[PDB]
Amino acid sequence: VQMEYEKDVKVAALDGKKIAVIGYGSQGHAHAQNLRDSGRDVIIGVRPGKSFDKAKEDGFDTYTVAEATKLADVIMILAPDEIQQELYEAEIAPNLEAGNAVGFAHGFNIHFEFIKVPADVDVFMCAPKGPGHLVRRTYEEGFGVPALYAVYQDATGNAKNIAMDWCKGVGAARVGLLETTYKEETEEDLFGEQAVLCGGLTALIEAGFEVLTEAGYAPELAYFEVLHEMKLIVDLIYEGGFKKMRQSISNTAEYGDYVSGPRVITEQVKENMKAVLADIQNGKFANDFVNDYKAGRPKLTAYREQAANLEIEKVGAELRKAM
Amino acid sequence: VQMEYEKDVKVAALDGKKIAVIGYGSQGHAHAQNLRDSGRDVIIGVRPGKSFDKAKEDGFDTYTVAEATKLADVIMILAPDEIQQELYEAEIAPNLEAGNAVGFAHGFNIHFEFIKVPADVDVFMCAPKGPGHLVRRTYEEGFGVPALYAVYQDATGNAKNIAMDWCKGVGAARVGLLETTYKEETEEDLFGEQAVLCGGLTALIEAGFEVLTEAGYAPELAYFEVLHEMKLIVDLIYEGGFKKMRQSISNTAEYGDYVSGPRVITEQVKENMKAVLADIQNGKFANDFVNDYKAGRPKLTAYREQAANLEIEKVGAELRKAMP
């Protein structure tokens, strides 16, 4: 795959389209605001009222989801993944017309087929590689967040151009687009956040914190050693890969990196990651997530309360206040 | 342990002291410049070369290491771990006097006793938690970088005040100080970078990249999902802990974090980390590093050439090129 930019957006397919953004949270506010600034005709569809109000104070024509959908040619669904199916069936599906296009910023519901959009309606995706605040902030600074785009079903023959023009309208084409599929986006995105970015990383940090504090080292000092000082390291990797990071740290640190990294992340850990990937591919994780929501979020409830009680989180809150 | 600030620096112990900074790399430069703008009296000692004349052109009275040490009451050694011992024995040790204070910004050589300073000389530490350019820049902007301080041996009774006043001089007390010991600073610093920050992290990213690419997913896309996107995640944790990060990500991502993190980092991984800590505490890692260095860095050489061949590094350099 080769990276694409504004010059690669052959057709301004959002030209003459009424656009409805559904929802107004992390991604919702960012997409709507960026597209508006880009000159697109954008309305908001959302439930009352604390996303509804902010959207109307931000100057948007704000309707119910059903009304916004009925008015629109292009409908981008930016409600939480767990509620998209019920919301789609009740409020969106009845108000679609042939030739419409439905968009997502993550392929979960379409790929796992919790949602099935009619055959005469396009389904596309623009998936920015950052939360909404960054998607918005970078845009405002004349910049952007790179994005993936994909098409799940192309009824009109215009679906790919709609996806790429959406990317352009939100600023992503300023810095780089990569084409993918709904399957690849969904599976790689779930895997990355689970095994490495969020799950893997927080568990790694917490394990390191436990080993130090259980060994008798001060938690305040341990906080810096496994969390606070991570930002400088990851900024280096972001800028110049492992190469730049390892050039920048001391030879003692670099040698420790090479020797101890493989002691910690072993072949068995890689097999653990393969099991995580398997449950993404086979629909188990997806069903577990949706089933937790349907049951009243009991697992998410226990996890959130557990995470609130972590010593590293208590200590870190105190230290970040003291700085 | 409670964080300390400028109000907790009880004695201006560097008052009237002749301060020599050994080394004029980013670290040496930062400490020296900061102390000068804070109103202290600093000279630089370093071998002849680029740094020597940059120091001379920076306005510092610049000498060799031997002569800077001779003139100074307080000698801060800011050179790489691997050259400190040779440099100390040859140039510094024969020029120390009773009542002097020797400083370090990391405890490796003093803790593992590759260097033994005479018992009528103080040994202290100020260890800012950032690289030289950041220590300088933050100070120039009017704040600083937080720091640990410690004392290994106190002959004069002034060693702790010297350490804390040094911290104050380089701007660290503006933002926060934590007292530690040479042993704990050294062991925690080695452990953190080995098990979590550098070793664990790069190995985690690489394993994830391998799992995706071996399963047939595109490497360019995998680069974003295990490496590029980590920066904003860690930025969030830096600013607001796991809590802020998990608020920003989708509920889908957050649930995946809670469920899958423990499947990847298991009890056995924690035991692996305990083994890493053990080799730090028992001197085995320290000896292995020094022995590799004395032997011409053969392990370091093989490791570096292997790292240069990683697919994620080749794909990544190309993508970062494509994203100015």
Ligand SMILES: NC(=O)c1ccc[n+]([C@@H]2O[C@H](COP(=O)([O-])OP(=O)(O)OC[C@H]3O[C@@H](n4cnc5c(N)ncnc54)[C@H](OP(=O)(O)O)[C@@H]3O)[C@@H](O)[C@H]2O)c1
């Ligand atoms: N969050 C990220 O960083 C991120 C990154 C990449 C991709 N994505 C994807 O983008 C999509 C949305 O993510 P998100 O973080 O923006 O979710 P979010 O933070 O939970 O935002 C949900 C928004 O939709 C509103 N809402 C709740 N129920 C609604 C309903 N029936 N009808 C209309 N609006 C409703 C919410 O208003 P209330 O507050 O009043 O409930 C809120 O404003 C997901 O598919 C996600 O995978 C997210």
Ligand SMILES: [Mg+2]
């Ligand atoms: Mg992800």
Ligand SMILES: [Mg+2]
């Ligand atoms: Mg995601």
